[PDB]
Amino acid sequence: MQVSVETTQGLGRRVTITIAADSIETAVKSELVNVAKKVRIDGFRKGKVPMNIVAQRYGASVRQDVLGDLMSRNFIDAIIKEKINPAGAPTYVPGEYKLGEDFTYSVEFEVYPEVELQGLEAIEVEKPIVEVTDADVDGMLDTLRKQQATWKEKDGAVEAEDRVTIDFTGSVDGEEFEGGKASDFVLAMGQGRMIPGFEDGIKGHKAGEEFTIDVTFPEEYHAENLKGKAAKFAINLKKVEERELPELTAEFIKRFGVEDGSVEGLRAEVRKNMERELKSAIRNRVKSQAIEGLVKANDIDVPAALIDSEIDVLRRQAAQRFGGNEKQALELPRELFEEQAKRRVVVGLLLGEVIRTNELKADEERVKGLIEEMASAYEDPKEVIEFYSKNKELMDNMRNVALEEQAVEAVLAKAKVTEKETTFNELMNQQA
Amino acid sequence: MQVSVETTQGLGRRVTITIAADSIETAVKSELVNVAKKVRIDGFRKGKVPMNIVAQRYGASVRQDVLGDLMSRNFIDAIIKEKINPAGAPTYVPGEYKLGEDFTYSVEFEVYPEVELQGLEAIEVEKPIVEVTDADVDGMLDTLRKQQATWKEKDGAVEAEDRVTIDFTGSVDGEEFEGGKASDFVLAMGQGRMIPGFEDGIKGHKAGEEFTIDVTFPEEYHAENLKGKAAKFAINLKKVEERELPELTAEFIKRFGVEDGSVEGLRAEVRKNMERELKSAIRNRVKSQAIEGLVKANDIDVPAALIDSEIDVLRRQAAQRFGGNEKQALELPRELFEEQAKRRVVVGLLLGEVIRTNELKADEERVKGLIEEMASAYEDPKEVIEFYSKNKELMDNMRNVALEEQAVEAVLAKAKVTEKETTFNELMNQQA
């Protein structure tokens, strides 16, 4: 019960305990026998030199490293039972050993965070008040007709959700880079298959037209050679499938969006889903300001252990998109992902404290409605409800999202919400 | 069935295989899905970018490292099923990558050796012919009476198998080293608890006598500071238990040798055991000359893989003796154990081919006799026979020893054996 263990830094802990002679040669000597038997390797020790005598005679000679072996044995045994699976090899960071002085070492394992909330009354929440006007309706109607163009060739009627066969070459400052080498490539526009700006700039151009587009790329880009670099892309565009002139074709109701729908059904389903995405837009718009305000108002120390964990996870997420790759994602630069990781860690901590202090729960009842609304986007909602509920991972992931809004709403009720009417331009600020 | 794989060095192998476009995007794409499902992580990939498209679009960009990941995945999956356990981290030794040329890498796993026999007719076996004379009997009887001294004090009647309390300090050339620091230490002489010569040199001295002893240490010693160093050891020797003057004490029949025995029983059992050790002495004497002759006559390339394996095992054997330690034995110098390891590897290879060519077997019947002879040194041979046979490890290890003599005897029947009479001094050559 009475033991002495210290802490170094991070998850590192320091042991090196001094015990009495009667304690040493009794407990330690016997303990070794027990561990040997546990692995059933006790019978493998042919002892010219009896263990009791040898450990007593040369015990002091390598007693330091004996402790090291024990430390090693406990560490491996502990990780297996705690279900901690380290990939590759952990880095053991020891200090310089001084002969005569004490020694300090790392050894990483368990974690434990603590948070506090301040500046809550300073949280000003902006709620934009918007509505649909005639101009919006007319614009929507005008756009819908412009999407009506069936199978035919030449000219140029590029759709914002169709297949465009693009022949292009990656040229930035008049120089060609490693990427940008593609042939007979079919790009689906509107799905976010390219860097923002690039797939949108195609709109308005004709097939067989050379124009070039101005793309600057994000500052936070995985490829340093292209980060914040203005690329031009010549775009020769030779053939392309194209679709001009509206006639009778039955594919615009079964090749667009999700599943296949009727003339009125497609409009209805698109209308609800468009408004559904509006929920995301408004919610994110509100969330970003709230988060930004808290970070600026309250600058606090951030645990590196949490950051490292998130960075490593982010690398997997990015690699998944990069090419569905893993493992090699480890070699990706830390700083490129650490900047956003800091934000994610802080957000989680802030939300978590709200959850702890108010004792929030993942409400299954609220989740029920969310699942049912999603299920209503399919031919049969009943099978979807069963499908979703028969998979723990889907339920759990949904609950995480549901909890996110619950945590925010709890904060909102405790904060200063101001409702202001605004223009559509302000809601277009979804760049970040 | 038609594949191309090359070899590099050691256990290293080179893959890097070129395939047609149809083969690539078909088999590789589908294989990834199968492996994902095997780990049941396929449902975790929320794909903004479809796998079929991303792996094609950016497939060539990181295709090299994709192969690397696959290589990584195959390696770990293979070792688990092959029951290969690597302790620590395997060093992946790659070469320098040239942009435009081919690449060569290691990656170690499976082994496969081959041997040939030559100079068999040149094997000259020395068989010493010796016999017991009256002088041997007189000397034996003389020695036996000299061991007859019972409990008492002072003077000095040190036995070559009793407990001696020695107070000593480790001093080599007038300098004290890290070791040699022991107090109240009870040393059992005759059992080989010390460096050959040190414990023997005690014989003849008196309790409370300062004399110093010349100990040179082996050239092949684990401690570099003491390897081939002449140590003196001052030896003060203050108390000691001692045993002088022969009276009636019942402990010389139950505190000597193995188990307890009667007056005639002890002599009889000692007599057979002494002759038993003679078998070992003669066998080793014959073996050493035979092995040494073969090595000098046939110098062949030795596979490093086998040597590395033996060295690591030797370090365990040495560490077991050092303090019953493992793991840290890894840090022990390679060159200090590699020299004897080379010999052990060569001997094993030579013996192995004898076994392969003549198709030798581990003769259970011969083993039965050996077990019975060992069992005949106990109070009840029957329980020992059951004891031994109910333990696979004991049986197997015994068979290894039995096989050793069988292999040697097979060689002897093919080699030139010459029987020569010799003196007892030549048989004392057991230093190596």
PDB file of N, CA, C and O in Angstrom, chain B residues 113-168:
ATOM      1  N   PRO B 113      19.640 -23.928 -45.782  1.00  0.00           N
ATOM      2  CA  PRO B 113      21.066 -24.265 -45.903  1.00  0.00           C
ATOM      3  C   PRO B 113      21.348 -25.599 -46.659  1.00  0.00           C
ATOM      4  O   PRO B 113      20.455 -26.432 -46.826  1.00  0.00           O
ATOM      5  N   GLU B 114      22.605 -25.760 -47.101  1.00  0.00           N
ATOM      6  CA  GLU B 114      23.096 -26.995 -47.756  1.00  0.00           C
ATOM      7  C   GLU B 114      24.538 -27.289 -47.347  1.00  0.00           C
ATOM      8  O   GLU B 114      25.320 -26.361 -47.116  1.00  0.00           O
ATOM      9  N   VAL B 115      24.891 -28.579 -47.263  1.00  0.00           N
ATOM     10  CA  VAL B 115      26.235 -28.999 -46.825  1.00  0.00           C
ATOM     11  C   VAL B 115      26.781 -30.145 -47.718  1.00  0.00           C
ATOM     12  O   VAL B 115      26.013 -30.856 -48.365  1.00  0.00           O
ATOM     13  N   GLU B 116      28.116 -30.287 -47.757  1.00  0.00           N
ATOM     14  CA  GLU B 116      28.780 -31.399 -48.447  1.00  0.00           C
ATOM     15  C   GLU B 116      29.906 -31.943 -47.557  1.00  0.00           C
ATOM     16  O   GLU B 116      30.447 -31.209 -46.731  1.00  0.00           O
ATOM     17  N   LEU B 117      30.249 -33.219 -47.715  1.00  0.00           N
ATOM     18  CA  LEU B 117      31.304 -33.831 -46.887  1.00  0.00           C
ATOM     19  C   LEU B 117      32.545 -34.172 -47.713  1.00  0.00           C
ATOM     20  O   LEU B 117      32.440 -34.770 -48.785  1.00  0.00           O
ATOM     21  N   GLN B 118      33.719 -33.785 -47.211  1.00  0.00           N
ATOM     22  CA  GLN B 118      34.990 -34.099 -47.871  1.00  0.00           C
ATOM     23  C   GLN B 118      36.072 -34.358 -46.823  1.00  0.00           C
ATOM     24  O   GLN B 118      35.978 -33.877 -45.690  1.00  0.00           O
ATOM     25  N   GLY B 119      37.089 -35.126 -47.203  1.00  0.00           N
ATOM     26  CA  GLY B 119      38.201 -35.397 -46.303  1.00  0.00           C
ATOM     27  C   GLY B 119      37.849 -36.364 -45.186  1.00  0.00           C
ATOM     28  O   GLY B 119      38.513 -36.386 -44.152  1.00  0.00           O
ATOM     29  N   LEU B 120      36.821 -37.175 -45.403  1.00  0.00           N
ATOM     30  CA  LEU B 120      36.356 -38.127 -44.394  1.00  0.00           C
ATOM     31  C   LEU B 120      37.432 -39.162 -44.072  1.00  0.00           C
ATOM     32  O   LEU B 120      37.654 -39.509 -42.913  1.00  0.00           O
ATOM     33  N   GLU B 121      38.100 -39.645 -45.105  1.00  0.00           N
ATOM     34  CA  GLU B 121      39.149 -40.640 -44.957  1.00  0.00           C
ATOM     35  C   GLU B 121      40.360 -40.063 -44.222  1.00  0.00           C
ATOM     36  O   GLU B 121      41.226 -40.803 -43.751  1.00  0.00           O
ATOM     37  N   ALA B 122      40.416 -38.740 -44.134  1.00  0.00           N
ATOM     38  CA  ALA B 122      41.528 -38.058 -43.493  1.00  0.00           C
ATOM     39  C   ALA B 122      41.267 -37.843 -42.005  1.00  0.00           C
ATOM     40  O   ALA B 122      42.106 -37.278 -41.292  1.00  0.00           O
ATOM     41  N   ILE B 123      40.117 -38.297 -41.530  1.00  0.00           N
ATOM     42  CA  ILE B 123      39.771 -38.131 -40.132  1.00  0.00           C
ATOM     43  C   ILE B 123      40.481 -39.187 -39.297  1.00  0.00           C
ATOM     44  O   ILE B 123      40.215 -40.387 -39.423  1.00  0.00           O
ATOM     45  N   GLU B 124      41.390 -38.728 -38.458  1.00  0.00           N
ATOM     46  CA  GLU B 124      42.144 -39.595 -37.578  1.00  0.00           C
ATOM     47  C   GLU B 124      41.644 -39.437 -36.157  1.00  0.00           C
ATOM     48  O   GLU B 124      41.730 -38.355 -35.574  1.00  0.00           O
ATOM     49  N   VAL B 125      41.127 -40.505 -35.604  1.00  0.00           N
ATOM     50  CA  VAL B 125      40.563 -40.472 -34.276  1.00  0.00           C
ATOM     51  C   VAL B 125      41.508 -41.099 -33.275  1.00  0.00           C
ATOM     52  O   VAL B 125      41.953 -42.236 -33.453  1.00  0.00           O
ATOM     53  N   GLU B 126      41.810 -40.357 -32.231  1.00  0.00           N
ATOM     54  CA  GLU B 126      42.681 -40.830 -31.182  1.00  0.00           C
ATOM     55  C   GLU B 126      41.870 -41.461 -30.060  1.00  0.00           C
ATOM     56  O   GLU B 126      41.035 -40.802 -29.441  1.00  0.00           O
ATOM     57  N   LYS B 127      42.104 -42.731 -29.808  1.00  0.00           N
ATOM     58  CA  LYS B 127      41.461 -43.404 -28.704  1.00  0.00           C
ATOM     59  C   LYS B 127      42.514 -43.777 -27.671  1.00  0.00           C
ATOM     60  O   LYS B 127      43.319 -44.685 -27.895  1.00  0.00           O
ATOM     61  N   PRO B 128      42.555 -43.058 -26.546  1.00  0.00           N
ATOM     62  CA  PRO B 128      43.524 -43.323 -25.501  1.00  0.00           C
ATOM     63  C   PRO B 128      43.181 -44.578 -24.715  1.00  0.00           C
ATOM     64  O   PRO B 128      42.045 -44.757 -24.266  1.00  0.00           O
ATOM     65  N   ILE B 129      44.154 -45.445 -24.561  1.00  0.00           N
ATOM     66  CA  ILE B 129      43.964 -46.656 -23.801  1.00  0.00           C
ATOM     67  C   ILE B 129      44.578 -46.481 -22.428  1.00  0.00           C
ATOM     68  O   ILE B 129      45.790 -46.302 -22.295  1.00  0.00           O
ATOM     69  N   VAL B 130      43.738 -46.509 -21.412  1.00  0.00           N
ATOM     70  CA  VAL B 130      44.187 -46.318 -20.046  1.00  0.00           C
ATOM     71  C   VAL B 130      43.584 -47.365 -19.127  1.00  0.00           C
ATOM     72  O   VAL B 130      42.587 -48.008 -19.470  1.00  0.00           O
ATOM     73  N   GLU B 131      44.195 -47.536 -17.971  1.00  0.00           N
ATOM     74  CA  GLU B 131      43.744 -48.505 -16.999  1.00  0.00           C
ATOM     75  C   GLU B 131      44.089 -48.029 -15.597  1.00  0.00           C
ATOM     76  O   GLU B 131      44.963 -47.181 -15.425  1.00  0.00           O
ATOM     77  N   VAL B 132      43.401 -48.565 -14.606  1.00  0.00           N
ATOM     78  CA  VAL B 132      43.627 -48.178 -13.223  1.00  0.00           C
ATOM     79  C   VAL B 132      44.752 -49.012 -12.620  1.00  0.00           C
ATOM     80  O   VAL B 132      44.763 -50.243 -12.754  1.00  0.00           O
ATOM     81  N   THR B 133      45.699 -48.350 -11.980  1.00  0.00           N
ATOM     82  CA  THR B 133      46.825 -49.032 -11.372  1.00  0.00           C
ATOM     83  C   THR B 133      46.747 -48.962  -9.846  1.00  0.00           C
ATOM     84  O   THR B 133      45.853 -48.319  -9.289  1.00  0.00           O
ATOM     85  N   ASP B 134      47.679 -49.633  -9.175  1.00  0.00           N
ATOM     86  CA  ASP B 134      47.721 -49.647  -7.708  1.00  0.00           C
ATOM     87  C   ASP B 134      47.938 -48.252  -7.165  1.00  0.00           C
ATOM     88  O   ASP B 134      47.391 -47.889  -6.125  1.00  0.00           O
ATOM     89  N   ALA B 135      48.736 -47.466  -7.881  1.00  0.00           N
ATOM     90  CA  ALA B 135      49.037 -46.097  -7.474  1.00  0.00           C
ATOM     91  C   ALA B 135      47.766 -45.261  -7.427  1.00  0.00           C
ATOM     92  O   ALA B 135      47.585 -44.434  -6.530  1.00  0.00           O
ATOM     93  N   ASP B 136      46.888 -45.489  -8.395  1.00  0.00           N
ATOM     94  CA  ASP B 136      45.610 -44.794  -8.457  1.00  0.00           C
ATOM     95  C   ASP B 136      44.776 -45.148  -7.241  1.00  0.00           C
ATOM     96  O   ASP B 136      44.140 -44.285  -6.632  1.00  0.00           O
ATOM     97  N   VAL B 137      44.793 -46.430  -6.881  1.00  0.00           N
ATOM     98  CA  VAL B 137      44.057 -46.911  -5.720  1.00  0.00           C
ATOM     99  C   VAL B 137      44.601 -46.283  -4.434  1.00  0.00           C
ATOM    100  O   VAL B 137      43.832 -45.781  -3.603  1.00  0.00           O
ATOM    101  N   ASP B 138      45.929 -46.284  -4.292  1.00  0.00           N
ATOM    102  CA  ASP B 138      46.583 -45.706  -3.114  1.00  0.00           C
ATOM    103  C   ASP B 138      46.263 -44.223  -2.997  1.00  0.00           C
ATOM    104  O   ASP B 138      45.941 -43.733  -1.912  1.00  0.00           O
ATOM    105  N   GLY B 139      46.334 -43.519  -4.123  1.00  0.00           N
ATOM    106  CA  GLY B 139      46.033 -42.103  -4.137  1.00  0.00           C
ATOM    107  C   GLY B 139      44.591 -41.824  -3.774  1.00  0.00           C
ATOM    108  O   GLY B 139      44.301 -40.886  -3.026  1.00  0.00           O
ATOM    109  N   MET B 140      43.680 -42.639  -4.300  1.00  0.00           N
ATOM    110  CA  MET B 140      42.260 -42.481  -4.009  1.00  0.00           C
ATOM    111  C   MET B 140      41.989 -42.683  -2.520  1.00  0.00           C
ATOM    112  O   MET B 140      41.291 -41.889  -1.892  1.00  0.00           O
ATOM    113  N   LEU B 141      42.573 -43.739  -1.960  1.00  0.00           N
ATOM    114  CA  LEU B 141      42.410 -44.056  -0.542  1.00  0.00           C
ATOM    115  C   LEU B 141      42.999 -42.952   0.327  1.00  0.00           C
ATOM    116  O   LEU B 141      42.420 -42.568   1.351  1.00  0.00           O
ATOM    117  N   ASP B 142      44.149 -42.447  -0.093  1.00  0.00           N
ATOM    118  CA  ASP B 142      44.832 -41.368   0.614  1.00  0.00           C
ATOM    119  C   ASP B 142      43.947 -40.127   0.672  1.00  0.00           C
ATOM    120  O   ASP B 142      43.779 -39.514   1.729  1.00  0.00           O
ATOM    121  N   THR B 143      43.356 -39.793  -0.467  1.00  0.00           N
ATOM    122  CA  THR B 143      42.474 -38.644  -0.579  1.00  0.00           C
ATOM    123  C   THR B 143      41.224 -38.796   0.302  1.00  0.00           C
ATOM    124  O   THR B 143      40.806 -37.848   0.971  1.00  0.00           O
ATOM    125  N   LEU B 144      40.657 -40.000   0.319  1.00  0.00           N
ATOM    126  CA  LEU B 144      39.429 -40.267   1.073  1.00  0.00           C
ATOM    127  C   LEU B 144      39.618 -40.011   2.570  1.00  0.00           C
ATOM    128  O   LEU B 144      38.761 -39.411   3.216  1.00  0.00           O
ATOM    129  N   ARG B 145      40.743 -40.462   3.121  1.00  0.00           N
ATOM    130  CA  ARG B 145      41.011 -40.266   4.545  1.00  0.00           C
ATOM    131  C   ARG B 145      41.217 -38.788   4.863  1.00  0.00           C
ATOM    132  O   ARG B 145      40.819 -38.309   5.928  1.00  0.00           O
ATOM    133  N   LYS B 146      41.843 -38.073   3.934  1.00  0.00           N
ATOM    134  CA  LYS B 146      42.112 -36.649   4.099  1.00  0.00           C
ATOM    135  C   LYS B 146      40.828 -35.817   4.100  1.00  0.00           C
ATOM    136  O   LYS B 146      40.814 -34.700   4.601  1.00  0.00           O
ATOM    137  N   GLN B 147      39.755 -36.370   3.542  1.00  0.00           N
ATOM    138  CA  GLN B 147      38.462 -35.690   3.545  1.00  0.00           C
ATOM    139  C   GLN B 147      37.707 -35.977   4.845  1.00  0.00           C
ATOM    140  O   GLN B 147      36.628 -35.433   5.093  1.00  0.00           O
ATOM    141  N   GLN B 148      38.273 -36.842   5.674  1.00  0.00           N
ATOM    142  CA  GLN B 148      37.660 -37.182   6.944  1.00  0.00           C
ATOM    143  C   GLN B 148      38.121 -36.273   8.064  1.00  0.00           C
ATOM    144  O   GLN B 148      39.137 -36.518   8.723  1.00  0.00           O
ATOM    145  N   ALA B 149      37.372 -35.204   8.234  1.00  0.00           N
ATOM    146  CA  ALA B 149      37.559 -34.241   9.298  1.00  0.00           C
ATOM    147  C   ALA B 149      36.185 -33.712   9.678  1.00  0.00           C
ATOM    148  O   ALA B 149      35.392 -33.366   8.801  1.00  0.00           O
ATOM    149  N   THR B 150      35.886 -33.665  10.958  1.00  0.00           N
ATOM    150  CA  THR B 150      34.558 -33.278  11.390  1.00  0.00           C
ATOM    151  C   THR B 150      34.496 -31.842  11.931  1.00  0.00           C
ATOM    152  O   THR B 150      35.416 -31.054  11.734  1.00  0.00           O
ATOM    153  N   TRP B 151      33.397 -31.519  12.604  1.00  0.00           N
ATOM    154  CA  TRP B 151      33.140 -30.164  13.080  1.00  0.00           C
ATOM    155  C   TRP B 151      34.100 -29.748  14.204  1.00  0.00           C
ATOM    156  O   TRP B 151      34.263 -30.467  15.188  1.00  0.00           O
ATOM    157  N   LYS B 152      34.736 -28.585  14.016  1.00  0.00           N
ATOM    158  CA  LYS B 152      35.635 -27.966  15.000  1.00  0.00           C
ATOM    159  C   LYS B 152      36.146 -26.640  14.470  1.00  0.00           C
ATOM    160  O   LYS B 152      35.616 -26.142  13.476  1.00  0.00           O
ATOM    161  N   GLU B 153      37.150 -26.057  15.105  1.00  0.00           N
ATOM    162  CA  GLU B 153      37.570 -24.717  14.729  1.00  0.00           C
ATOM    163  C   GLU B 153      39.083 -24.542  14.547  1.00  0.00           C
ATOM    164  O   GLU B 153      39.887 -25.378  14.965  1.00  0.00           O
ATOM    165  N   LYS B 154      39.417 -23.425  13.877  1.00  0.00           N
ATOM    166  CA  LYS B 154      40.786 -22.926  13.658  1.00  0.00           C
ATOM    167  C   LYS B 154      41.653 -23.826  12.765  1.00  0.00           C
ATOM    168  O   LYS B 154      41.208 -24.853  12.256  1.00  0.00           O
ATOM    169  N   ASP B 155      42.907 -23.383  12.593  1.00  0.00           N
ATOM    170  CA  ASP B 155      43.929 -24.054  11.791  1.00  0.00           C
ATOM    171  C   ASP B 155      43.626 -23.938  10.306  1.00  0.00           C
ATOM    172  O   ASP B 155      43.969 -22.936   9.687  1.00  0.00           O
ATOM    173  N   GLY B 156      42.969 -24.927   9.739  1.00  0.00           N
ATOM    174  CA  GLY B 156      42.648 -24.856   8.339  1.00  0.00           C
ATOM    175  C   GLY B 156      42.609 -26.201   7.663  1.00  0.00           C
ATOM    176  O   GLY B 156      43.652 -26.747   7.273  1.00  0.00           O
ATOM    177  N   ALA B 157      41.414 -26.731   7.526  1.00  0.00           N
ATOM    178  CA  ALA B 157      41.182 -27.978   6.827  1.00  0.00           C
ATOM    179  C   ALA B 157      40.088 -27.762   5.788  1.00  0.00           C
ATOM    180  O   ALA B 157      38.976 -28.287   5.902  1.00  0.00           O
ATOM    181  N   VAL B 158      40.413 -26.967   4.785  1.00  0.00           N
ATOM    182  CA  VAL B 158      39.462 -26.598   3.758  1.00  0.00           C
ATOM    183  C   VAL B 158      39.160 -27.775   2.827  1.00  0.00           C
ATOM    184  O   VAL B 158      40.065 -28.395   2.269  1.00  0.00           O
ATOM    185  N   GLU B 159      37.877 -28.055   2.665  1.00  0.00           N
ATOM    186  CA  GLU B 159      37.408 -29.144   1.829  1.00  0.00           C
ATOM    187  C   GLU B 159      37.106 -28.626   0.424  1.00  0.00           C
ATOM    188  O   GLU B 159      36.778 -27.449   0.244  1.00  0.00           O
ATOM    189  N   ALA B 160      37.196 -29.501  -0.557  1.00  0.00           N
ATOM    190  CA  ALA B 160      36.977 -29.125  -1.943  1.00  0.00           C
ATOM    191  C   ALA B 160      35.505 -29.266  -2.339  1.00  0.00           C
ATOM    192  O   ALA B 160      35.192 -29.416  -3.517  1.00  0.00           O
ATOM    193  N   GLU B 161      34.606 -29.224  -1.350  1.00  0.00           N
ATOM    194  CA  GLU B 161      33.170 -29.310  -1.619  1.00  0.00           C
ATOM    195  C   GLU B 161      32.361 -28.827  -0.398  1.00  0.00           C
ATOM    196  O   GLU B 161      31.207 -29.204  -0.204  1.00  0.00           O
ATOM    197  N   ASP B 162      32.968 -27.967   0.408  1.00  0.00           N
ATOM    198  CA  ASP B 162      32.298 -27.457   1.606  1.00  0.00           C
ATOM    199  C   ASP B 162      32.018 -25.953   1.461  1.00  0.00           C
ATOM    200  O   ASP B 162      32.224 -25.378   0.387  1.00  0.00           O
ATOM    201  N   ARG B 163      31.560 -25.329   2.534  1.00  0.00           N
ATOM    202  CA  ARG B 163      31.216 -23.917   2.530  1.00  0.00           C
ATOM    203  C   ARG B 163      32.351 -23.114   3.127  1.00  0.00           C
ATOM    204  O   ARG B 163      32.766 -23.367   4.256  1.00  0.00           O
ATOM    205  N   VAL B 164      32.848 -22.148   2.401  1.00  0.00           N
ATOM    206  CA  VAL B 164      33.888 -21.309   2.933  1.00  0.00           C
ATOM    207  C   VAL B 164      33.411 -19.867   2.952  1.00  0.00           C
ATOM    208  O   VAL B 164      32.954 -19.346   1.936  1.00  0.00           O
ATOM    209  N   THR B 165      33.494 -19.235   4.104  1.00  0.00           N
ATOM    210  CA  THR B 165      33.114 -17.844   4.223  1.00  0.00           C
ATOM    211  C   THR B 165      34.324 -16.988   3.889  1.00  0.00           C
ATOM    212  O   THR B 165      35.289 -16.946   4.651  1.00  0.00           O
ATOM    213  N   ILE B 166      34.281 -16.315   2.756  1.00  0.00           N
ATOM    214  CA  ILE B 166      35.433 -15.576   2.299  1.00  0.00           C
ATOM    215  C   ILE B 166      35.183 -14.078   2.275  1.00  0.00           C
ATOM    216  O   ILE B 166      34.201 -13.604   1.698  1.00  0.00           O
ATOM    217  N   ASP B 167      36.062 -13.347   2.926  1.00  0.00           N
ATOM    218  CA  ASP B 167      36.065 -11.905   2.854  1.00  0.00           C
ATOM    219  C   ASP B 167      37.158 -11.475   1.885  1.00  0.00           C
ATOM    220  O   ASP B 167      38.355 -11.644   2.149  1.00  0.00           O
ATOM    221  N   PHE B 168      36.754 -10.961   0.742  1.00  0.00           N
ATOM    222  CA  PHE B 168      37.709 -10.619  -0.292  1.00  0.00           C
ATOM    223  C   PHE B 168      37.365  -9.310  -0.975  1.00  0.00           C
ATOM    224  O   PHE B 168      36.234  -8.829  -0.908  1.00  0.00           O
TER     225      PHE B 168
END
